[PDB]
Amino acid sequence: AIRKKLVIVGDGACGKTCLLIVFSKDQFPEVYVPTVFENYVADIEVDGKQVELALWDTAGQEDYDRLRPLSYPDTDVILMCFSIDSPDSLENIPEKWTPEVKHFCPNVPIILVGNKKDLRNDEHTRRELAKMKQEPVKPEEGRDMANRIGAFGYMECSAKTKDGVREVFEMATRAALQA
Amino acid sequence: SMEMDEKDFAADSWSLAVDSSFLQQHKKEVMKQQDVIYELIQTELHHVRTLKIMTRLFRTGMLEELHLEPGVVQGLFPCVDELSDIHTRFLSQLLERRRQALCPGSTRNFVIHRLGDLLISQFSGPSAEQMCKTYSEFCSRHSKALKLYKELYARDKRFQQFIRKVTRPAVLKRHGVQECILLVTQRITKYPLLISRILQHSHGIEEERQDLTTALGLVKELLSNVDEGIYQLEKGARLQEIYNR
Numbered sequence: 505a506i507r508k509k510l511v512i513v514g515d516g517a518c519g520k521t522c523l524l525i526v527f528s529k530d531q532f533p534e535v536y537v538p539t540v541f542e543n544y545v546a547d548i549e550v551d552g553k554q555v556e557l558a559l560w561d562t563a564g565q566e567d568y569d570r571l572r573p574l575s576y577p578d579t580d581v582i583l584m585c586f587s588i589d590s591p592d593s594l595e596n597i598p599e600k601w602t603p604e605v606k607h608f609c610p611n612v613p614i615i616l617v618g619n620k621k622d623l624r625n626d627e628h629t630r631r632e633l634a635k636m637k638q639e640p641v642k643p644e645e646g647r648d649m650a651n652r653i654g655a656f657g658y659m660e661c662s663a664k665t666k667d668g669v670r671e672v673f674e675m676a677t678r679a680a681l682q683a
Numbered sequence: 684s685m686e687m688d689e690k691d692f693a694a695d696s697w698s699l700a701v702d703s704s705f706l707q708q709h710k711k712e713v714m715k716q717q718d719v720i721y722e723l724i725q726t727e728l729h730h731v732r733t734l735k736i737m738t739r740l741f742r743t744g745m746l747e748e749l750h751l752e753p754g755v756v757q758g759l760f761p762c763v764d765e766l767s768d769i770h771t772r773f774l775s776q777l778l779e780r781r782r783q784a785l786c787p788g789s790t791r792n793f794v795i796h797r798l799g800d801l802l803i804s805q806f807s808g809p810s811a812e813q814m815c816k817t818y819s820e821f822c823s824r825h826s827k828a829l830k831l832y833k834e835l836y837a838r839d840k841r842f843q844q845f846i847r848k849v850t851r852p853a854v855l856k857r858h859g860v861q862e863c864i865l866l867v868t869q870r871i872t873k874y875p876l877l878i879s880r881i882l883q884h885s886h887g888i889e890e891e892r893q894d895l896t897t898a899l900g901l902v903k904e905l906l907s908n909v910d911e912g913i914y915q916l917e918k919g920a921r922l923q924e925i926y927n928r
């Protein structure tokens with residue numbers, strides 16, 4: 505197996521730690537959802553190729569501009585995360601996270617991931633957002649942002665229900681394998 | 684790690700580690716607070732273990748089996764002894780606090796009611812100064828350590844065979860040289876996340892909520908200080924490149 509490195513970036517409200525935990529755990533966290541994620545080396549077989557994918561989180565590093573880039577050396581694929589229940593986290597992608605990722609990781613594929621897709625049709629989420637003249641992120645808004653920032657692709661998932669989680673990581677492995 | 688501490692922290696949570704008859708006696712809010720405190724200790728145990736892999740497995744093994752130029756091993760594992768000292772002492776205090784709280788006749792049933800005081804002591808005074816100085820030095824030497832590792836693996840056969848040999852066991856899957864370095868750098872930024880979530884479930888005793896709020900502000904001050912003192916070192920950097928920053 506070849507070794508590839510994945511790093512997930514995005515605002516704290518995007519659920520990046522939850523996504524890494526749910527993919528790596530083996531049996532969903534039914535009793536306790538961990539606060540933090542250390543690291544993990546996933547054994548993935550995608551399109552007949554065996555890869556060891558090391559997974560890393562940037563959670564806790566958002567306010568520390570000189571510590572955060574130490575997570576970037578030799579990254580093969582970037583997961584740029586936002587939450588579908590937070591249009592504000594999508595708005596932080598093009599001029600906060602994207603210029604940083606392109607400076608420290610030139611030529612590294614970025615996959616824009618819209619997390620918490622289950623909240624798109626949640627009435628509590630729709631009510632809370634409507635109080636700030638907002639609504640859940642629409643699929644076309646996610647796709648247009650991925651297009652605008654030069655992302656390799658756009659994907660959606662729900663860490664809560666596990667839907668679309670496996671597909672994100674298999675695609676991230678394919679992206680890390682490309683020239 | 685030592686077997687005693689590994690078995691004590693083997694379960695996914697405090698609610699799964701204690702006896703179910705002991706769990707049944709506590710309020711939901713106490714269980715939530717205890718699960719987060721258990722995660723802080725469990726991850727501190729793993730962090731100290733990462734530092735022992737660096738000093739005993741990698742560093743010492745290189746000194747005892749390889750012929751490397753003097754100062755190369757230090758460049759690969761900067762401040763590892765100072766870091767292992769700070770965190771082994773902090774882990775000793777966390778584990779002693781759990782041990783004192785055990786019920787008589789039990790090695791697993793306990794409740795930690797007073798974590799704040801221990802966190803204020805760790806993140807203040809001389810111990811805070813030593814963490815600030817050690818992490819400012821470590822994180823400034825981080826990129827240099829990775830580049831030095833990559834050079835040795837690619838150009839030295841005996842170094843490449845040493846790495847493959849000592850990292851072959853499955854328990855070392857996520858603990859290579861570069862992984863251990865990033866695991867250490869990322870550790871200090873996990874503290875505010877764990878402490879804020881412990882604070883969330885610690886409003887029952889007002890002295891405890893205040894101690895945890897003070898500890899949170901202390902950890903944040905330390906992180907801000909470490910962040911401001913970082914400047915990446917580059918092997919063979921010229922003075923002109925440094926003073927034109």
Ligand SMILES: COCC(=O)NCc1nc2ccccc2[nH]1
Pocket residue numbers: 521522537538539540876
């Ligand atoms: C520090 O934040 C990272 C994390 O994963 N905290 C635990 C956590 N995250 C949750 C999301 C939904 C429901 C319950 C949850 N519990």
Ligand SMILES: COCC(=O)NCc1nc2ccccc2[nH]1
Pocket residue numbers: 534535536698714715716718719
């Ligand atoms: C099936 O699970 C029922 C249960 O009791 N879980 C324990 C539990 N729930 C928590 C919520 C927040 C913080 C820590 C927690 N720990």
